[PDB]
Amino acid sequence: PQSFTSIARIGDYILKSPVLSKLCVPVANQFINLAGYKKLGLKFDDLIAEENPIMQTALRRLPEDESYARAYRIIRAHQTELTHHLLPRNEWIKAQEDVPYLLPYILEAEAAAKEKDELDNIEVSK
Amino acid sequence: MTAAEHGLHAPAYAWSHNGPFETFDHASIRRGYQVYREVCAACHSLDRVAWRTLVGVSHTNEEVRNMAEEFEYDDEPDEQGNPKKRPGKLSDYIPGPYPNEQAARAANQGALPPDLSLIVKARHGGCDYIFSLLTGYPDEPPAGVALPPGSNYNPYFPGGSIAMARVLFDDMVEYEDGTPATTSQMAKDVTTFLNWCAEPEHDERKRLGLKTVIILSSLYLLSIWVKKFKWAGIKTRKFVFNPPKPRK
Amino acid sequence: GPPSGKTYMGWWGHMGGPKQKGITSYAVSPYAQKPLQGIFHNAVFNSFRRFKSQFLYVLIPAGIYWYWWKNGNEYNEFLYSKAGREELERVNV
Amino acid sequence: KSTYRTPNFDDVLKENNDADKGRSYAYFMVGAMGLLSSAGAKSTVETFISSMTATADVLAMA
Amino acid sequence: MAFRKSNVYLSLVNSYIIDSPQPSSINYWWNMGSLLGLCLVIQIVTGIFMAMHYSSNIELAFSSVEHIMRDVHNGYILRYLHANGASFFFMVMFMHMAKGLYYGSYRSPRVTLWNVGVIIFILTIATAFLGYCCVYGQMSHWGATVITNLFSAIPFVGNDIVSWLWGGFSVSNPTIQRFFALHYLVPFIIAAMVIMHLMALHIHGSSNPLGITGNLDRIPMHSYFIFKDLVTVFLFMLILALFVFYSPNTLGHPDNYIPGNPLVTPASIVPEWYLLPFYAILRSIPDKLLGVITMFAAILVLLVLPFTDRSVVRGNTFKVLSKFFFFIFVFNFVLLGQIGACHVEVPYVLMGQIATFIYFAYFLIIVPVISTIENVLFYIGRVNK
Amino acid sequence: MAFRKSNVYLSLVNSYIIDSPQPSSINYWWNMGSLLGLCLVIQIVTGIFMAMHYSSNIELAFSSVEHIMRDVHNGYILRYLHANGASFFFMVMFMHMAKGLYYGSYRSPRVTLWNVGVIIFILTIATAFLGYCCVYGQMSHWGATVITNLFSAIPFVGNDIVSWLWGGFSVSNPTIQRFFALHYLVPFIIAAMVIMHLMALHIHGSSNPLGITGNLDRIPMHSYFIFKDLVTVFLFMLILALFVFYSPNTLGHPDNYIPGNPLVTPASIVPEWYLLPFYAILRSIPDKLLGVITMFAAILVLLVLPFTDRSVVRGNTFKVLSKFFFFIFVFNFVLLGQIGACHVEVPYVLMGQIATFIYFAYFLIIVPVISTIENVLFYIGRVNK
Amino acid sequence: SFSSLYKTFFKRNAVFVGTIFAGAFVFQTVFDTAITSWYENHNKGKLWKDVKARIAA
Numbered sequence A: 001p002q003s004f005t006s007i008a009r010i011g012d013y014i015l016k017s018p019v020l021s022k023l024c025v026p027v028a029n030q031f032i033n034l035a036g037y038k039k040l041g042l043k044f045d046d047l048i049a050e051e052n053p054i055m056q057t058a059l060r061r062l063p064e065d066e067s068y069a070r071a072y073r074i075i076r077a078h079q080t081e082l083t084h085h086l087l088p089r090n091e092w093i094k095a096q097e098d099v100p101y102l103l104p105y106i107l108e109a110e111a112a113a114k115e116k117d118e119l120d121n122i123e124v125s126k
Numbered sequence B: 001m002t003a004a005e006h007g008l009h010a011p012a013y014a015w016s017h018n019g020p021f022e023t024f025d026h027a028s029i030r031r032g033y034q035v036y037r038e039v040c041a042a043c044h045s046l047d048r049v050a051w052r053t054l055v056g057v058s059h060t061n062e063e064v065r066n067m068a069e070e071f072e073y074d075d076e077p078d079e080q081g082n083p084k085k086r087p088g089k090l091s092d093y094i095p096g097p098y099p100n101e102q103a104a105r106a107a108n109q110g111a112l113p114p115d116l117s118l119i120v121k122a123r124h125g126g127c128d129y130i131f132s133l134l135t136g137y138p139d140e141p142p143a144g145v146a147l148p149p150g151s152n153y154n155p156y157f158p159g160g161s162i163a164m165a166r167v168l169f170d171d172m173v174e175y176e177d178g179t180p181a182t183t184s185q186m187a188k189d190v191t192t193f194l195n196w197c198a199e200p201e202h203d204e205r206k207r208l209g210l211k212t213v214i215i216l217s218s219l220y221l222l223s224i225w226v227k228k229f230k231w232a233g234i235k236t237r238k239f240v241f242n243p244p245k246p247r248k
Numbered sequence C: 001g002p003p004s005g006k007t008y009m010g011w012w013g014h015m016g017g018p019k020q021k022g023i024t025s026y027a028v029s030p031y032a033q034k035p036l037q038g039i040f041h042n043a044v045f046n047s048f049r050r051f052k053s054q055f056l057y058v059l060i061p062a063g064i065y066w067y068w069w070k071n072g073n074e075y076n077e078f079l080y081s082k083a084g085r086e087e088l089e090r091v092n093v
Numbered sequence D: 001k002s003t004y005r006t007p008n009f010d011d012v013l014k015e016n017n018d019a020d021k022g023r024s025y026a027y028f029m030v031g032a033m034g035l036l037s038s039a040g041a042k043s044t045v046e047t048f049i050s051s052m053t054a055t056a057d058v059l060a061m062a
Numbered sequence E, F: 001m002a003f004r005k006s007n008v009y010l011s012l013v014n015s016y017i018i019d020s021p022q023p024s025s026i027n028y029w030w031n032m033g034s035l036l037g038l039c040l041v042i043q044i045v046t047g048i049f050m051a052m053h054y055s056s057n058i059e060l061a062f063s064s065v066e067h068i069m070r071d072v073h074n075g076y077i078l079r080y081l082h083a084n085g086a087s088f089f090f091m092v093m094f095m096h097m098a099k100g101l102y103y104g105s106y107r108s109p110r111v112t113l114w115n116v117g118v119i120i121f122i123l124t125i126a127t128a129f130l131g132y133c134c135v136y137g138q139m140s141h142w143g144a145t146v147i148t149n150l151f152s153a154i155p156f157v158g159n160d161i162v163s164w165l166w167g168g169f170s171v172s173n174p175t176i177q178r179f180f181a182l183h184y185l186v187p188f189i190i191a192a193m194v195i196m197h198l199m200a201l202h203i204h205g206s207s208n209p210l211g212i213t214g215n216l217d218r219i220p221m222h223s224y225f226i227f228k229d230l231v232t233v234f235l236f237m238l239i240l241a242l243f244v245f246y247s248p249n250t251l252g253h254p255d256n257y258i259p260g261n262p263l264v265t266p267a268s269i270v271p272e273w274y275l276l277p278f279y280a281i282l283r284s285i286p287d288k289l290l291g292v293i294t295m296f297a298a299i300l301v302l303l304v305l306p307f308t309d310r311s312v313v314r315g316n317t318f319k320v321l322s323k324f325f326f327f328i329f330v331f332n333f334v335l336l337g338q339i340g341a342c343h344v345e346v347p348y349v350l351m352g353q354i355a356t357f358i359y360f361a362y363f364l365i366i367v368p369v370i371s372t373i374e375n376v377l378f379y380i381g382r383v384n385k
Numbered sequence G: 001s002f003s004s005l006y007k008t009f010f011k012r013n014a015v016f017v018g019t020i021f022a023g024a025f026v027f028q029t030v031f032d033t034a035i036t037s038w039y040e041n042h043n044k045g046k047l048w049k050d051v052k053a054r055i056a057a
């Protein structure tokens, strides 16, 4: 449960600093390759663990045909994974695809929550 | 750890029984008992072995009945309430040389000779280490090693100082069958006999072991096959995606 | 049966997942296939791929660990040898 | 594509030599496992029961 | 509805073994709990059957086991199976606990599931230890002295606890007799506990070697996994057969065919293998109270794992930096074990010390660090700005 | 929802002990299963604590219990509680089984509920018998001879079974040792079984001293019955305290402070009281095979009770002709017991025989008859034509 | 395993629980036959039977 709102903070910063960005992103790119996951038709937002309220605010909200999309991949994943194989090289999700389709809502919802947390314990000075 | 405190590693002699398919050499066991009887019985108990247990392994029914009765076990009191002896039965356990822990030590400079019944398992290396400590009493305690009064040197014991003096000296046993009653042949036997003593089940144990594996292996391979069959629909199962017109 | 606490699993027809549309599956009877579906031949080109894809992640750490093992091992045999008793009297007290 | 359009199992399916070898091989498989299992299950039981017959050190027919 | 669903008894049977919806994608790692339940059953059957000829009196104790060996019909098979089996129990259980780390099973909603297994693991060590103290060889009488003595580490009352717990001056007769009785009791406690463990498992169902949601492609445990589990089963028995008939003591310490003697500790104190890595950790600490604490802490620390894992995904599967240290952890743990076998000699002590550090640091330090980094690699490794 | 409802563990706790909807009208008879679970717990605690000082070797056996008596701290309290408790277990269990006859609990949908209790009752006799054979006094060694010998009654193989089951020529040492081990095992089987018993109970809920539907006026077990059950509990302990401290053997046979002797049966063979009515039934039959069968049948016959009850209402409560014979049944059963204590002298044998008849006739004959009549009294005793 | 040689006995159904147990019963003698033979042979000369042979008393 390291927060997405928190990964935003850190990863935005690094993306902005042309200093940092040039150092980090090569590796990060190298990383999201060695993961293996785009070879099981998986976009990264598929991987995010869901058994928690925020993601269930964030999937109830996710556009229909978008969820049908997720779905097919997630089943394609399992299916292949169980065949103990990797997909036909040209079925792999391509580097431009791995887009944070979910991340707004996760962020949208995280935001909303932290707000309510605050507004439940908002104190008073007289 | 200094190689002196450890003791020298006994080597991998090639015993009759080493291997997954190897019964003991019962002829060998038969010899060890004599090598046992005449030599080491003088000091060493073999209490968890019973006369009957010999029958069918090293001897024949009377052969063991004979040995058995050469000793007077205690026996239930007469009508008056006074003790009595009696010879042994096959139902008995081969009696120790000493009447208690003390006289065992009295007779050995205060050493307590280990009961041997379990020796080939109560030691690392075991068969080898037994052979080697018995054929490894070298002539003199190596340059510099200063040995206490009533203690010998052995590289195979830890820190060499063994309270048991050498005991195998060629031919001291008259090998009844008529084999070279050497020391490396007097020894190799009492080892094979002492092996038995700590692991009597032995030949059956590999017998049954054989069956267990052959059946169990086959089940393993058989099970595998079966599995791919019941999975065959899921393994070769194949999906397809067709996005659907936006209206719901 | 009292109320049950909500989870992230249900049973068939209410398994818990999102509302599937679009996928279409196909399969074939386990009777209706070659006994030995795909064995040897090209099914083994993977027994070296399922190997390659990972071995480093085990070997590298196994390596680090097995050489570190061998080292102080050697080092111990030394300081407990003749040639070593010197260093011992120093390292050890 | 159309949904009727049927994917390829020509690799997996057997040639029409016999639509009955993929059954016969399986049953001798399942069956010889069945056999041996039982045969083992039998012995396993036999073993623990006979654990209770008179210990080797009693039968004092005296 | 069908009967197996309708019946009060068969409905459980069905819903945990026949009709259970498993992720379609889970592999042979998951066959471990199955094979775990199988050992517990092998432990309990062979144990009872042996107890029928066992005597827990400090005299007859060592001998009676020899009795089971020399005399009882198939009795040697009873012993070598009990003993070798306890080991395989422990291997399989480590592999089961491994699997849980690697794929990050310990991770919500499965915390309680996880936590309970930590209780089971504790009870299995407690159990197997007592069963060892019941042979009453050398390793037994001195094993039983030290574990009883861990309690002295307790401020003030500690010695008395030990005295109590001993029922007298030393690990004596009222000791082996209670150690036998408690050895009977406890395995039913494990089984009791295996049930809550399986209940937790049940309300969330198993995870997958992909750490995504199962709820889109479930299949029923019968007949796939029932048959899948049967493959690991036979294989399990095979290696166990191998040891039991051919290598019955390639896993035990020869010091234990020596009748226990309260005046004379041996000079080769190697404890059980599955125990070694803890012996190591214990020794690594030149302080008594702290050393004890750190040994116990070596197991408890396992409970922080769902908090310190900072990640956003369950599973080392798509996790290179995670995989890597995960196998440093495994391999450390084995080394730690090698350290347990060797004498408190140099550099071994200092090697021991370093592994121990690596050990706790892996839960407490490496993991939350790495996983936080790994979150950030996952962000910048794609998005625009 | 509330946590106790939501939790995987506390939800059971709640739904079987806190939030359970009981009929509003049930009386102190129903406090028996509660008090039943309490004995089983008293049996298991005190047993284990005693086993820690028990030796099951045929020599040390009789003495070791004296050891528990003379030496172990509070050990006499351990014994008198184990033993007197076993009795109260059996009383309470009869009263529990009584209640089930009288109010016709055995009656659908509660058949399985009922049936399982017949299994429990069987296992409790099996259990307590073995626990007796473990004292190894006189009554013990001869008790253990006869029960082992019931198996000879089995055609052909029967003697061998007995030989096996003995582990040798006589009830010897491999016998008391297995009888100890099986005494450990079985109580967990009762507890296992008490769980299915409580599961059956659960899906239908308790009946009422009115044999009508509960579903119109339920109240929750907490806090009424939890507190109600607490009244019978203390009362239970009181009488048990009374025996345990003041009348510790007002329930046992003095022949049992005599060390068992395999050559010499006593000449006062009174067996345990809760067992007597069966001893009676057994003796009543001058044939060996048939006699055995009829003894076992004395318990099995209890399984027909839901078929032979022909009635249209559950409960003797509104049932005069039913009440009446129901207490002939109770009172027969007690007499049968008195017969067990007396010698096979006259007219006792012939009295024994008649009771035995009355016994089975009550299930098999009186009940379906009476109940069918009683249906018809209920019709013509109102309607016009 | 050949489709002819199998289907002869069992046509197009598996083995039947009782036929299994029957085979089991037979197999169990046929096996303990073979294996106990091959083992007594493999260890020829070594068995106390072979040693009872030469040795006289």
Ligand code: HEM
Pocket (backbone or CB within 6 Å): B035, B036, B039, B040, B041, B042, B043, B044, B108, B111, B112, B113, B114, B119, B123, B130, B134, B162, B163, B164, B167, B190
């Ligand atoms: C086949 C002949 C014999 C064998 C195989 C044998 C074997 C052994 C073994 C295995 C030990 C154990 C030491 C260890 O491994 O830690 C031992 C010790 C001893 N033996 Fe023997 N023995 C034999 C004959 C004798 C004889 C003839 C005597 C005296 C008459 C004797 C007196 C002793 C004594 C006093 C010890 C105690 C040594 C110690 O405590 O280190 N043994 N023997």
Ligand code: HEM
Pocket (backbone or CB within 6 Å): E029, E030, E031, E032, E033, E034, E036, E037, E040, E093, E096, E097, E100, E105, E106, E110, E113, E114, E115, E116, E117, E118, E119, E120, E121, E190, E194, E197, E201, E205, E206, E207, E208
């Ligand atoms: C008596 C010992 C044990 C038994 C009988 C047992 C049983 C099982 C079974 C049957 C499963 C389902 C199959 C599988 O997922 O492997 C499982 C999974 C699991 N076990 Fe255990 N286990 C035991 C020990 C442990 C221990 C010692 C732990 C932790 C310290 C643990 C934690 C878990 C967790 C978290 C899962 C879920 C795995 C997943 O998501 O796939 N278990 N266990």
Ligand code: HEM
Pocket (backbone or CB within 6 Å): E040, E043, E044, E045, E046, E047, E048, E049, E050, E051, E054, E065, E078, E079, E080, E082, E083, E086, E089, E124, E127, E128, E129, E130, E131, E132, E134, E135, E183, E184, E187, E190, E252
């Ligand atoms: C979780 C289950 C169990 C574990 C892990 C376990 C562990 C052990 C171990 C390690 C030993 C020493 C084995 C040896 O080296 O000889 C032992 C011995 C023994 N156990 Fe168990 N045990 C378990 C269950 C049981 C049960 C249910 C009984 C029922 C009576 C039992 C009875 C005995 C007896 C009589 C011995 C002494 C004979 C022997 O050592 O083989 N055990 N146990």
Ligand code: HEM
Pocket (backbone or CB within 6 Å): F029, F030, F031, F032, F033, F034, F036, F037, F040, F093, F096, F097, F100, F105, F106, F110, F113, F114, F115, F116, F117, F118, F119, F120, F121, F190, F194, F197, F201, F205, F206, F207, F208
């Ligand atoms: C270990 C022994 C037993 C335990 C722990 C036990 C437990 C219970 C409990 C807690 C109840 C609920 C309270 C009550 O209704 O009394 C109950 C009721 C019942 N028991 Fe048992 N019982 C035992 C023995 C038996 C036996 C021996 C039988 C039959 C042979 C039996 C059959 C029934 C039936 C049919 C009910 C339902 C009673 C009703 O409708 O009120 N039980 N039992």
Ligand code: HEM
Pocket (backbone or CB within 6 Å): F040, F043, F044, F045, F046, F047, F048, F049, F050, F051, F054, F065, F078, F079, F080, F082, F083, F086, F089, F124, F127, F128, F129, F130, F131, F132, F134, F135, F183, F184, F187, F190, F252
């Ligand atoms: C349903 C549960 C139980 C019943 C009905 C039962 C019954 C009995 C009986 C009737 C006796 C003879 C008592 C005497 O006259 O001295 C006995 C003895 C004994 N029982 Fe149990 N028992 C049960 C559970 C247990 C348990 C769980 C243990 C655990 C070790 C145990 C251990 C013993 C021991 C060591 C004795 C001999 C000492 C003595 O007789 O008091 N029992 N049992």
Ligand SMILES: COc1c(O)c(C)c(C/C=C(\C)CC/C=C(\C)CC/C=C(\C)CC/C=C(\C)CC/C=C(\C)CCC=C(C)C)c(O)c1OC
Pocket (backbone or CB within 6 Å): E016, E017, E020, E022, E026, E030, E031, E033, E034, E036, E037, E038, E040, E041, E044, E045, E048, E191, E192, E194, E201, E205, E206, E221, E225, E229, F182
């Ligand atoms: C969610 O995913 C799952 C899953 O849920 C399950 C269940 C399995 C299958 C796993 C299991 C079925 C494991 C279950 C484990 C147990 C049931 C262990 C419980 C064992 C006990 C409680 C032991 C109790 C034993 C006894 C009472 C036997 C003792 C009786 C004796 C000794 C009688 C002998 C005495 C005499 C005198 C003859 C999976 O493979 C799986 O993966 C996909």
Ligand SMILES: COc1c(O)c(C)c(C/C=C(\C)CC/C=C(\C)CC/C=C(\C)CC/C=C(\C)CC/C=C(\C)CCC=C(C)C)c(O)c1OC
Pocket (backbone or CB within 6 Å): E182, F016, F017, F020, F022, F026, F030, F031, F033, F034, F036, F037, F038, F040, F041, F044, F045, F048, F191, F192, F194, F201, F205, F206, F221, F225, F229
């Ligand atoms: C439908 O109507 C009901 C109803 O359902 C219930 C539940 C009750 C209440 C009844 C109960 C709660 C009965 C429940 C009975 C049980 C729970 C019995 C189960 C007992 C066991 C399973 C025993 C198991 C015991 C142990 C494991 C303890 C052993 C531990 C030991 C010995 C540790 C000590 C050892 C050392 C070394 C310290 C009613 O009164 C009632 O009537 C209105």
Ligand SMILES: CCCCCCCCCCCO[C@@H]1O[C@H](CO)[C@@H](O[C@H]2O[C@H](CO)[C@@H](O)[C@H](O)[C@H]2O)[C@H](O)[C@H]1O
Pocket (backbone or CB within 6 Å): D030, D031, D034, D035, D037, D038, D039, D041, G012, G013, G014, G015, G016, G017, G018, G020
């Ligand atoms: C725990 C101890 C276990 C001991 C060993 C167990 C041995 C199990 C043997 C059981 C054999 O059970 C056997 O299973 C086969 C399926 O393979 C059944 O076959 C049944 O389904 C098959 C399809 O699979 C059909 O061809 C057939 O018409 C039908 O009868 C058959 O009715 C039964 O006879």
Ligand SMILES: O=C1C(O)=C([C@H]2CC[C@H](c3ccc(Cl)cc3)CC2)C(=O)c2ccccc21
Pocket (backbone or CB within 6 Å): E122, E125, E139, E140, E142, E143, E144, E146, E147, E269, E270, E271, E272, E275, E276, E278, E279, E282, E295, E296, E299
């Ligand atoms: O000195 C010890 C010793 O310290 C242990 C150790 C092994 C690990 C034990 C342990 C206890 C509890 C847990 Cl949760 C983990 C390990 C503690 C005792 C032994 O097992 C041992 C065996 C035989 C002789 C001496 C000894």
Ligand SMILES: O=C1C(O)=C([C@H]2CC[C@H](c3ccc(Cl)cc3)CC2)C(=O)c2ccccc21
Pocket (backbone or CB within 6 Å): F122, F125, F139, F140, F142, F143, F144, F146, F147, F269, F270, F271, F272, F275, F276, F278, F279, F282, F295, F296, F299
């Ligand atoms: O002869 C017997 C005898 O027959 C029983 C009887 C008592 C009832 C037993 C019984 C066994 C099983 C059931 Cl299901 C019911 C009762 C059978 C043995 C004894 O309990 C007994 C005790 C002491 C000495 C002799 C004897």
